[PDB]
Design a protein around this ligand. Structure first.
Ligand SMILES: [Zn+2]
Length: 255
Protein backbone atom coordinates (compact mmCIF):
# COMPACT_ATOMS: atom_id res chain seq x y z
CA UNK A 1 0.00 0.00 0.00
CA UNK A 2 0.93 3.66 -0.33
CA UNK A 3 0.09 6.57 1.95
CA UNK A 4 1.05 10.24 1.74
CA UNK A 5 2.86 11.60 4.79
CA UNK A 6 0.50 13.43 7.14
CA UNK A 7 -2.54 11.34 6.18
CA UNK A 8 -4.47 8.49 7.79
CA UNK A 9 -5.72 5.31 6.22
CA UNK A 10 -8.29 2.79 7.45
CA UNK A 11 -6.85 -0.73 7.36
CA UNK A 12 -9.39 -3.51 6.87
CA UNK A 13 -8.68 -6.92 8.41
CA UNK A 14 -10.48 -10.21 8.90
CA UNK A 15 -12.15 -10.26 12.33
CA UNK A 16 -12.11 -14.02 12.88
CA UNK A 17 -9.26 -15.30 15.08
CA UNK A 18 -7.50 -11.90 14.99
CA UNK A 19 -5.28 -11.37 18.04
CA UNK A 20 -3.22 -8.21 17.60
CA UNK A 21 -1.91 -5.60 15.15
CA UNK A 22 1.63 -4.34 15.69
CA UNK A 23 4.06 -1.79 14.28
CA UNK A 24 7.38 -2.97 15.66
CA UNK A 25 6.55 -3.26 19.36
CA UNK A 26 3.69 -0.73 19.18
CA UNK A 27 0.14 -2.11 19.35
CA UNK A 28 -2.44 -0.56 17.02
CA UNK A 29 -6.06 -0.71 18.30
CA UNK A 30 -8.85 -2.13 16.15
CA UNK A 31 -12.58 -1.37 15.96
CA UNK A 32 -15.53 -2.99 14.15
CA UNK A 33 -16.28 -2.42 10.50
CA UNK A 34 -19.79 -0.91 10.68
CA UNK A 35 -20.90 -2.48 7.39
CA UNK A 36 -19.06 -5.84 7.20
CA UNK A 37 -19.53 -7.91 10.36
CA UNK A 38 -16.61 -10.15 9.27
CA UNK A 39 -14.11 -7.25 9.20
CA UNK A 40 -12.41 -4.94 11.66
CA UNK A 41 -10.65 -1.64 11.01
CA UNK A 42 -7.59 0.19 12.28
CA UNK A 43 -6.34 3.71 11.64
CA UNK A 44 -2.73 3.98 10.51
CA UNK A 45 -1.24 7.48 10.25
CA UNK A 46 2.13 8.74 9.03
CA UNK A 47 3.66 11.86 10.60
CA UNK A 48 4.18 14.85 8.33
CA UNK A 49 7.68 15.59 9.66
CA UNK A 50 10.36 12.94 9.21
CA UNK A 51 8.27 9.83 8.47
CA UNK A 52 9.79 6.42 7.77
CA UNK A 53 10.31 5.54 4.13
CA UNK A 54 8.34 2.31 4.53
CA UNK A 55 6.28 0.60 7.21
CA UNK A 56 5.47 -3.06 7.78
CA UNK A 57 2.67 -3.98 10.18
CA UNK A 58 2.03 -7.53 11.35
CA UNK A 59 -1.50 -8.71 12.08
CA UNK A 60 -1.17 -11.71 14.41
CA UNK A 61 -3.91 -14.34 14.11
CA UNK A 62 -4.43 -17.49 16.15
CA UNK A 63 -2.95 -19.50 13.24
CA UNK A 64 -1.08 -17.03 11.06
CA UNK A 65 0.75 -13.74 10.78
CA UNK A 66 -0.20 -11.37 7.98
CA UNK A 67 2.29 -8.69 7.00
CA UNK A 68 1.20 -5.29 5.68
CA UNK A 69 3.65 -3.09 3.77
CA UNK A 70 2.98 0.64 3.49
CA UNK A 71 5.16 2.92 1.36
CA UNK A 72 5.36 6.60 2.36
CA UNK A 73 4.66 9.14 -0.39
CA UNK A 74 5.73 12.77 -0.27
CA UNK A 75 2.47 14.03 -1.76
CA UNK A 76 1.97 17.39 -3.41
CA UNK A 77 2.02 19.79 -0.46
CA UNK A 78 2.87 23.45 -0.83
CA UNK A 79 6.39 24.03 0.42
CA UNK A 80 8.67 27.04 0.69
CA UNK A 81 12.37 27.18 1.52
CA UNK A 82 13.12 28.83 4.84
CA UNK A 83 16.04 31.24 4.67
CA UNK A 84 16.88 32.08 8.30
CA UNK A 85 18.52 29.02 9.86
CA UNK A 86 18.13 30.43 13.39
CA UNK A 87 15.32 28.08 14.43
CA UNK A 88 15.98 27.60 18.16
CA UNK A 89 13.97 30.61 19.39
CA UNK A 90 14.62 31.82 22.95
CA UNK A 91 11.30 32.49 24.73
CA UNK A 92 11.16 33.95 28.24
CA UNK A 93 11.10 31.30 30.95
CA UNK A 94 7.49 32.05 31.84
CA UNK A 95 6.43 31.20 28.27
CA UNK A 96 8.64 28.10 27.99
CA UNK A 97 6.98 26.75 31.14
CA UNK A 98 3.44 27.32 29.88
CA UNK A 99 4.31 25.73 26.53
CA UNK A 100 5.86 22.70 28.24
CA UNK A 101 2.89 22.26 30.58
CA UNK A 102 0.26 22.50 27.83
CA UNK A 103 2.25 20.07 25.66
CA UNK A 104 2.36 17.47 28.47
CA UNK A 105 -1.37 17.88 29.05
CA UNK A 106 -2.21 17.59 25.36
CA UNK A 107 0.02 14.55 24.84
CA UNK A 108 -1.65 12.77 27.77
CA UNK A 109 -5.02 13.36 26.09
CA UNK A 110 -3.98 12.42 22.55
CA UNK A 111 -2.22 9.27 23.78
CA UNK A 112 -5.44 8.13 25.44
CA UNK A 113 -7.73 5.75 23.58
CA UNK A 114 -11.48 5.58 24.09
CA UNK A 115 -12.38 2.10 22.80
CA UNK A 116 -15.91 2.93 21.64
CA UNK A 117 -17.53 5.28 19.12
CA UNK A 118 -18.50 8.63 20.63
CA UNK A 119 -19.33 9.98 17.17
CA UNK A 120 -22.68 9.72 15.41
CA UNK A 121 -22.41 9.01 11.69
CA UNK A 122 -20.43 11.21 9.31
CA UNK A 123 -18.34 14.24 10.27
CA UNK A 124 -19.71 17.61 9.18
CA UNK A 125 -17.52 20.65 8.63
CA UNK A 126 -17.52 22.97 11.68
CA UNK A 127 -18.77 25.95 9.64
CA UNK A 128 -20.09 26.45 6.13
CA UNK A 129 -17.17 28.53 4.90
CA UNK A 130 -14.12 27.93 2.70
CA UNK A 131 -10.47 27.00 3.20
CA UNK A 132 -8.04 29.93 3.18
CA UNK A 133 -4.91 28.06 4.28
CA UNK A 134 -4.45 24.37 3.42
CA UNK A 135 -3.16 21.63 5.66
CA UNK A 136 0.44 20.68 5.07
CA UNK A 137 1.91 23.98 3.88
CA UNK A 138 5.53 23.48 4.86
CA UNK A 139 8.63 25.55 5.44
CA UNK A 140 11.79 23.58 4.67
CA UNK A 141 15.44 23.98 5.62
CA UNK A 142 18.18 21.40 4.88
CA UNK A 143 15.80 19.68 2.41
CA UNK A 144 13.89 18.78 5.61
CA UNK A 145 10.63 20.06 7.05
CA UNK A 146 11.20 22.78 9.62
CA UNK A 147 7.50 23.42 10.29
CA UNK A 148 4.12 22.83 8.71
CA UNK A 149 0.47 23.79 8.96
CA UNK A 150 -0.99 20.97 11.05
CA UNK A 151 -4.65 21.81 10.35
CA UNK A 152 -6.80 23.67 7.82
CA UNK A 153 -8.01 27.28 8.17
CA UNK A 154 -11.58 28.28 7.32
CA UNK A 155 -12.48 31.86 6.52
CA UNK A 156 -14.28 33.39 9.49
CA UNK A 157 -14.79 36.93 10.68
CA UNK A 158 -14.39 37.28 14.44
CA UNK A 159 -17.53 36.02 16.16
CA UNK A 160 -18.60 33.36 13.67
CA UNK A 161 -20.42 30.43 15.34
CA UNK A 162 -18.43 27.17 15.26
CA UNK A 163 -20.19 23.80 15.54
CA UNK A 164 -18.82 20.40 16.58
CA UNK A 165 -17.78 18.37 13.52
CA UNK A 166 -19.11 15.22 15.26
CA UNK A 167 -20.43 14.08 18.63
CA UNK A 168 -18.02 13.34 21.44
CA UNK A 169 -16.58 14.47 24.76
CA UNK A 170 -14.81 17.81 25.25
CA UNK A 171 -11.29 17.22 26.56
CA UNK A 172 -9.75 20.71 26.22
CA UNK A 173 -11.54 24.03 26.50
CA UNK A 174 -9.19 26.83 27.51
CA UNK A 175 -6.70 29.36 26.23
CA UNK A 176 -3.37 27.83 25.24
CA UNK A 177 -0.25 29.50 23.98
CA UNK A 178 -0.02 28.57 20.29
CA UNK A 179 -3.65 27.49 19.76
CA UNK A 180 -5.22 30.42 21.65
CA UNK A 181 -8.72 29.68 22.90
CA UNK A 182 -8.94 25.97 22.06
CA UNK A 183 -11.54 23.19 22.02
CA UNK A 184 -10.53 19.55 21.52
CA UNK A 185 -13.16 16.79 21.27
CA UNK A 186 -12.61 13.01 21.74
CA UNK A 187 -14.71 11.14 19.16
CA UNK A 188 -13.57 7.68 20.27
CA UNK A 189 -11.03 5.33 18.69
CA UNK A 190 -8.22 7.87 19.16
CA UNK A 191 -9.91 10.44 16.87
CA UNK A 192 -9.80 14.06 18.15
CA UNK A 193 -11.08 17.18 16.41
CA UNK A 194 -9.51 20.56 17.19
CA UNK A 195 -10.99 24.08 16.99
CA UNK A 196 -8.40 26.82 17.56
CA UNK A 197 -8.07 30.64 17.83
CA UNK A 198 -11.63 31.08 19.10
CA UNK A 199 -12.86 34.35 20.53
CA UNK A 200 -15.28 32.57 22.88
CA UNK A 201 -15.46 29.04 24.32
CA UNK A 202 -19.02 27.77 24.88
CA UNK A 203 -18.24 24.29 26.30
CA UNK A 204 -16.60 22.80 29.40
CA UNK A 205 -14.14 19.94 29.80
CA UNK A 206 -15.97 16.65 30.26
CA UNK A 207 -19.10 17.86 28.49
CA UNK A 208 -20.82 15.53 26.04
CA UNK A 209 -21.41 17.29 22.73
CA UNK A 210 -23.67 16.51 19.78
CA UNK A 211 -22.72 16.81 16.14
CA UNK A 212 -23.72 20.28 14.99
CA UNK A 213 -23.81 21.71 18.51
CA UNK A 214 -22.34 25.16 19.11
CA UNK A 215 -18.89 25.00 20.72
CA UNK A 216 -17.83 28.65 20.52
CA UNK A 217 -17.19 31.70 18.37
CA UNK A 218 -14.30 32.03 15.99
CA UNK A 219 -11.69 34.70 16.63
CA UNK A 220 -8.01 35.46 16.25
CA UNK A 221 -6.71 34.35 19.64
CA UNK A 222 -3.13 33.15 19.57
CA UNK A 223 -3.20 34.04 15.86
CA UNK A 224 -0.93 36.55 14.14
CA UNK A 225 -2.62 36.48 10.71
CA UNK A 226 -5.97 37.74 11.92
CA UNK A 227 -9.33 36.06 12.31
CA UNK A 228 -9.83 32.47 11.12
CA UNK A 229 -10.94 29.04 12.34
CA UNK A 230 -8.13 26.50 12.48
CA UNK A 231 -9.62 22.99 12.28
CA UNK A 232 -7.50 19.93 13.04
CA UNK A 233 -7.85 16.17 13.27
CA UNK A 234 -5.56 13.94 15.29
CA UNK A 235 -5.88 10.25 14.59
CA UNK A 236 -3.59 7.28 15.00
CA UNK A 237 -1.57 9.48 17.36
CA UNK A 238 -0.68 12.04 14.62
CA UNK A 239 -2.00 15.24 13.11
CA UNK A 240 -3.47 14.27 9.73
CA UNK A 241 -5.02 16.05 6.74
CA UNK A 242 -8.46 16.86 8.18
CA UNK A 243 -10.58 17.03 5.01
CA UNK A 244 -8.87 13.92 3.60
CA UNK A 245 -9.55 12.13 6.90
CA UNK A 246 -13.19 13.25 6.98
CA UNK A 247 -13.65 12.03 3.41
CA UNK A 248 -12.17 8.62 4.27
CA UNK A 249 -14.07 8.37 7.56
CA UNK A 250 -17.40 9.35 6.02
CA UNK A 251 -17.06 6.79 3.22
CA UNK A 252 -17.14 4.14 5.96
CA UNK A 253 -19.48 5.47 8.66
CA UNK A 254 -21.87 7.61 6.52
CA UNK A 255 -24.91 5.37 6.39
ZN1 LIG B 1 -4.32 26.87 10.90
Amino acid sequence: MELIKGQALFLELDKKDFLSLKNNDKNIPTFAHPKNQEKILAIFSLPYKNPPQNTKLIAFYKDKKEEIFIKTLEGNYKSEKLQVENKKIFPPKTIQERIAKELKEANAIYSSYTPKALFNGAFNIPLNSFITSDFGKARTFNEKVASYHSGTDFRAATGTPIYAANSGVVKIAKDRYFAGNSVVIDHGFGIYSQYYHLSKIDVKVGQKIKKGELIGLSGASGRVSGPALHFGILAGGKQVDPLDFVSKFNAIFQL
